Symmetry: D2
Subunit: 275 residues, 4 copies
């Protein structure tokens, strides 16, 4: 019942974590609050030059007094089961996801949880609010090759393209005498993606008739989780190419998102190719 | 930035709340732990004679030393977004839901939340862990007449009966030029029911081919939430009769559960009648 | 086991309280940290023009962008049993204590406690960290007419003046067949003063040979607690005049402090007069 | 900003710690509450046969169902700055302190702190309430050879024996041109002893005219802290022999307590010998 504790890009990550700490205890003026917490704590790290936020139309240039080498694209507050999303890399904020040096998300649940990766796999952390610090609870998290959960808003079935319609059909009526997958959809991305990571399976927000480029945002929603998910041995596709290979044409560009267990995503891609 | 605090069946409810407090900070040996916490704190209130638990095969008779007039059926730990469910009333534990004097649930999220009702509407509470007490955050909660969210596991589509198949079809393809409903399904009952209460709409765990009597348990899952939901102006049906009117034929009896906004549930019932 | 919560100078006090909240969870770079927390949260209230801090040589003038009518003298971190002290009123910071509109202290113990007064008695509050707000636990706190505790550093006995020597002698060897007083001295002012308020008795940091003007600071140590203590029905003297009547001749001026139950302080004054 | 955690007598200590956890968040029916928390958690460890409590007249024999090899003498709640004290070893509870296998105290401050020793020095712990576990913050704590603080209730000066009178005189008026010691006396033993450990110096509750055997209790006040203090390189005497060498003649026997920096206690003993 007794324990011991053991401990510029590093600088940046500690500040993002501190903002996540702050955001956590504060959990729509809340959107505003959490937004400025990130902006300001990020701008005190002396390691940023350009920030991209889901809450600001244009990129936020760090004054040279406090300027450093990294670029941070974030969604300060996404969605209980609310989240924060970020990736570290105005032209400097339009890099494809493959240039990501670091990224992660926090999920504000019964406990505040952080998935983090700097290119050598994914680590899961838990905010110890008493200590005011993040505790490692799992190293190098790896996703199942194949799961049994599919996760999308089926209320858009009327707007689905053929591939999505087909893939969902295969999940409910496997033509191979196997059990249908279970369905789960919280409707908060961080929460659905995090379940997908630890339990396995697939999460989709594809293009549909009413959102032809999907809903979720490339720079600070899709690219970050795609990075996390791939570092855990999964896949993240738009349906036509890996999310991390999209070349951003605007900082609030949307893309389709399909990610998860690699064999599930590969099954989806098969449905797309064969139309 | 300053506040003032203001304050036998009552006895029973404080003990259930205390167990919920304990359960909350402890959040599969966890199932065992939470179970005994309820049993023992309930048996110290000197107000129970018969307990029914999701974790115990048979009813748990209170010794006469500590015996009182009420009967408690509970699910100590259901399912982040885990919950606890209870209703207050061995033959003494097989009453139909209409004899309920009190019931509620807790949802262990970013905050621990309790929906409670003693027959005069529903009150929402928040556990103040610092104070170690529950704070009123909303009185007489009322559900929307009609919502725009439907919530069920569609991975069972292959096992759905005709009415369910039909109703889900109507939600995606409204034949009235209205928008399709949105879908949400966390897969934890307390979490799905609680969303249904505050946002409106409908939650279904109907009978299907593989679970012909549904999955959820009458005494300490379905009856409790049916009570909460009706006290908030909603409906809770098995498809053929109000949940609270089922006459229990066994303490772990299952029933179908459809509940929520009354006009949504009434639409469902229409689909059942007309088959 | 259930509760309800009920709710420009007001603005200023909420910000001081917020800084006390922040200081509380952060509890010598700590001195620096707590200092800036007060300064900055006070300067965001748009209600200050001049701040005086124990940590800054000179007064801190609020820019006109954020300027308001009140002056705040504070000790951000005094001294477990650490505290924060403040009074609300550069010439504008050299007012005698009688111009005080509001003052108080926080004591960071097992719980964070605030004694507060705006001229109509003293109220005691407890920081509810979960709620992030201060809860009233006692209104109009009144001190005993006479106590049985005396509190000073007797390790300075060799430096005491005659009156102090005499008074301490009378406490140990009452010449009236009454019990000697008990002694208590934590060595943190907020902690010793707070005990004096709730239990009664007397607290002394008189002049001595090595500190001829006493040790404690008039503007943000002595004046504040003198205000609190008098609003609770006590006295606060330098030995020659009420603390709140001293005319400040410098912002870090020291004065002797004797305060507490009025009959105890009056006994002390008798010892001074008769030398 | 990220951390990793690393982990029958052992059994007993974890349960004592758990009770300290419980006691901590509950911080005179409080005396009663904390008492039963210790008794019951100690009796669930299956490692005790005889308990001695400050709150129970007679020793508390563990039923054989749950009987083990160790004996625990404790003060569940002593005295903010409240504490809990215990030593591990009815005849089985009257052993001299030298048979102690383990002992410690908790101090319930701004943080809950535990000093612990099992014969190989003293370790300091901090309760991490979030983790619900105790974190090591300092290993093998060692006390100063000599301090500059003396700590006793001088309101008993009229009842002091000659040695105490003399020693206190030497502290205020050093006959060697050295500074007088500072005085500190919180009046809660755990708090005064803990300050003595980390800052150095001496703490006294000697015999006086009105308490000829001192006030503090041998089995669960004096023996425990004497053990802690000696394991940190200090001394603990009654004035005539080491506390840990007293042979208990009753389970609520009192003894004088003088402890702290060894050279300070040795100075005191000199004053006793030479009368
Ligand atoms: O209700 P829908 O259409 O299923 O969309 C839910 C999605 O929208 C989101 O709330 C994101 O919206 P934003 O892009 O505005 O931040 C995600 O968290 C979630 O996956
Ligand atoms: O995965 P499914 O089949 O959708 O079922 C999920 C349901 O099962 C539950 O976990 C209840 O299961 P239990 O009856 O064993 O407690 C509910 O919380 C939830 O609504
Ligand atoms: O050790 P001493 O001389 O008794 O002084 C203790 C006093 O000094 C203080 O720590 C204040 O010191 P500062 O004036 O530097 O803030 C008080 O809290 C306390 O009453
Ligand atoms: O007021 P006094 O006479 O100085 O005594 C204070 C002492 O009494 C105590 O409160 C202990 O009393 P108990 O023996 O009844 O537990 C100690 O914590 C403290 O050191």
């Amino acid at each position: 019942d007794m324990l011991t504790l053991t401990r510029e890009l590093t600088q940046l990550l500690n500040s993002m974590l501190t903002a996540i700490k702050a955001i956590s205890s504060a959990v729509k003026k809340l959107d505003v609050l959490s937004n400025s917490l990130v902006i300001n704590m990020l701008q005190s790290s002396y390691s940023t030059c350009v920030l991209v936020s889901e809450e600001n139309k244009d990129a936020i240039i760090t004054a040279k007094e406090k300027r450093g080498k990294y670029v941070v694209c974030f969604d300060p507050l996404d969605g209980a089961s609310i989240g924060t999303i970020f990736a570290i890399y105005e032209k400097d904020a339009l890099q494809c996801g493959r240039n990501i040096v670091a990224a992660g998300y926090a999920l504000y649940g019964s406990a505040t949880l952080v998935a983090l990766s700097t290119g050598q796999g994914v680590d899961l952390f838990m905010l110890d609010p008493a200590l005011g610090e993040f505790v490692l609870v799992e190293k190098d998290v790896k996703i199942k090759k194949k799961g049994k959960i599919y996760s999308l808003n089926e209320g858009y079935a009327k707007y689905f393209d053929a591939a999505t319609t087909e893939y969902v059909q295969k999940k409910k009526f496997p033509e191979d005498g196997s059990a249908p997958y279970g369905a789960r959809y919280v409707g908060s991305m961080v929460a659905d993606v995090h379940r997908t990571l630890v339990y396995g399976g697939i999460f989709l927000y594809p293009a549909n008739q009413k959102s032809p480029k999907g809903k979720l945002r490339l720079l600070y929603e899709c690219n970050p989780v795609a990075y996390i998910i791939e570092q855990a041995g999964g896949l993240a596709t738009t349906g036509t190419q890996p999310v991390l290979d999209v070349k951003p044409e605007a900082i609030h560009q949307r893309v389709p998102l399909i990610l998860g267990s690699p064999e599930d995503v590969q099954e989806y891609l098969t449905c797309v190719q064969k139309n």
